[PDB]
Design a protein around this ligand. Sequence first.
Ligand SMILES: *[C@@H]1O[C@H](CO[C@@H]2O[C@@H](C)[C@@H](O)[C@@H](O)[C@@H]2O)[C@@H](O[C@@H]2O[C@H](CO)[C@@H](O)[C@H](O)[C@H]2NC(C)=O)[C@H](O)[C@H]1NC(C)=O
Ligand SMILES: *[C@@H]1O[C@H](CO)[C@@H](O[C@@H]2O[C@H](CO)[C@@H](O)[C@H](O)[C@H]2NC(C)=O)[C@H](O)[C@H]1NC(C)=O
Ligand SMILES: *[C@@H]1O[C@H](CO)[C@@H](O)[C@H](O)[C@H]1NC(C)=O
Ligand SMILES: [Cl-]
Ligand SMILES: [Zn+2]
Lengths: 590, 13
Amino acid sequence: QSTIEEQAKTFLDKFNHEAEDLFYQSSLASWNYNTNITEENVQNMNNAGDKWSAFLKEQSTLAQMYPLQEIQNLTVKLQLQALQQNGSSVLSEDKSKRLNTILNTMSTIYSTGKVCNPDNPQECLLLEPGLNEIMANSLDYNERLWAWESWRSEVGKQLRPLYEEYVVLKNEMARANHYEDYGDYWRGDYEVNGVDGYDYSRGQLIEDVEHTFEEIKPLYEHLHAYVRAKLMNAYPSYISPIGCLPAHLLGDMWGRFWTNLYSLTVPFGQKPNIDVTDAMVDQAWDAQRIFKEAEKFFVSVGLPNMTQGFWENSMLTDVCHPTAWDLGKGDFRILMCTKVTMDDFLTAHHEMGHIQYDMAYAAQPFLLRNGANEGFHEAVGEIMSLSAATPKHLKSIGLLSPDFQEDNETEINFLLKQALTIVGTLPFTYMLEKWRWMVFKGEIPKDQWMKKWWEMKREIVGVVEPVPHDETYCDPASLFHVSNDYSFIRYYTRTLYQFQFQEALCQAAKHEGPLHKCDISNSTEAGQKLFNMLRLGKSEPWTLALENVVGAKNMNVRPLLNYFEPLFTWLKDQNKNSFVGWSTDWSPYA
Amino acid sequence: YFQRSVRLPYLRC
Ligand SMILES: *[C@@H]1O[C@H](CO[C@@H]2O[C@@H](C)[C@@H](O)[C@@H](O)[C@@H]2O)[C@@H](O[C@@H]2O[C@H](CO)[C@@H](O)[C@H](O)[C@H]2NC(C)=O)[C@H](O)[C@H]1NC(C)=O
Ligand SMILES: *[C@@H]1O[C@H](CO)[C@@H](O[C@@H]2O[C@H](CO)[C@@H](O)[C@H](O)[C@H]2NC(C)=O)[C@H](O)[C@H]1NC(C)=O
Ligand SMILES: *[C@@H]1O[C@H](CO)[C@@H](O)[C@H](O)[C@H]1NC(C)=O
Ligand SMILES: [Cl-]
Ligand SMILES: [Zn+2]
């Protein structure tokens, strides 16, 4: 309504038209390489990346002409906000060159990391598949210890001096962009300003993560105590009944998930879990049938069909990483090397959920065609596969016998398997990001980085290092996300969101019984509730968008606790002759 | 992977 505002709208109109054209062309160079990996496609991809990133830098320069204080249209403010951020441009050419070198070196060290046999230096193992296979399937305490320790001494020790300089440079970049530090800079993804009743400060995220973690601690402690007792049978004499779990016995290289502990902890092993892969092959199912079933599921809640261009341009059979593509101009695609299995049946529902999200906000301005925050998109995908895997859903589409009844023990097995992945990762994810936040804040001195890392592992996660690690180690950087400069708290917020979504959708569907058996299929009221948030994209604060589905403005862990309540009740009875919780004093080496 | 983002326009494949 003002001259600057009116000029701002005109600039964004030009930007949106140009961004759509160039992004679509860039996306095609991305689709072509990922489907046909050739040097010609690598080079066109490499050229498109520089064209796309240079264009955004120039538009960022043009966007500085429109001060935000004189803008009153929030939708205009939101796009100008994104375009005006300077990023690493605030650094001198020398420091940005140094930071890029450090960033590329850390990534290269992680991805080329290999450890070799001490008695045969020509025999070496990479993380994938070599060390990961040991960390998942080995019952040899010392072989697992060798894998866990060698990775941290070969890779993590290399990263340690680089990570120190990475922290200094990232904090410099963040402060010059008017943040307290790099951690504060990352927490800006959740920031909301200028919307009365919906604001969210960057410091508020720390409070809400800590408060919700407190509420999940009783469930995690009971899961931990049950897993500890089973691990004492699996690794006799190596685990204290009152102590933390040794870090190298958790089923992967870090204990990020406890998924691979299932066969060591399964409550009722004589009862097998549901696997309709045999039913799918016996019904002559193929990849087209799977995505047709997924399309019918979304249609049944009121959501639209897949576009005709989706079927003609998608690659649904044999870069096989399952992805959903939003190229713009009405072009939506799914890339999946689909097999006739229950897993790919569930993943197909997950990936089409991304597409449904993309199609709902397609009319938003270019930069607002995104999830409401970094946790929303994967939360939307996860709740789709939750409904599809329930026996109620599998019986409806005839992949399960009509007389099927899930019993006491199969339900406990499923919830425990779900908890090892979903609940097990929450203390891990919180503790890791808290350490980074404190390091960025300057609260952990360099000469105490590993001392505080393992103090926090012991206290927050109930996990203890099997051997002592001085400050020549950088154990956090031995995880991909840390050495490759990715924020981690999204895996925590996404997890809480997905159960908030599912509980609201299932209440709208008038579901009777425990949450984990709910199927939202054939519920147009559930789809309407969900679509009300999906259409918004990023055009409204995530607090408002969350309120459109669940009726509340903030992250809340009660729905997750409700989902696992039958397991929590069973665990309490199981643990009534065991210690619940841990002492941080015990260690394998003391 | 190309993205609709000013902080991370390109993601490694
Ligand atoms: C972003 O930084 C600019 C200045 O950096 C230059 O312009 C960028 C767009 C980028 O291309 C960099 O590589 C450039 O070196 C800031 O512009 C300054 O703003 C202050 C306002 O207090 C003003 O007094 C200065 O004269 C401006 N300097 C120039 C050269 O224009 C801009 O404010 C930054 N934007 C944000 C959102 O922080
Ligand atoms: C911010 O500006 C946009 C336009 O860029 C406004 O959206 C338009 O609003 C008018 C009047 O209601 C409609 O006729 C148009 O169809 C809308 N879209 C476009 C693309 O013009 C938006 O209303 C403005 N924000 C506020 C709060 O008024
Ligand atoms: C939805 O309802 C139709 C008929 O109303 C039925 O044929 C179909 O099996 C139902 N789907 C589910 C998932 O219950
Ligand atoms: Cl570690
Ligand atoms: Zn996903």
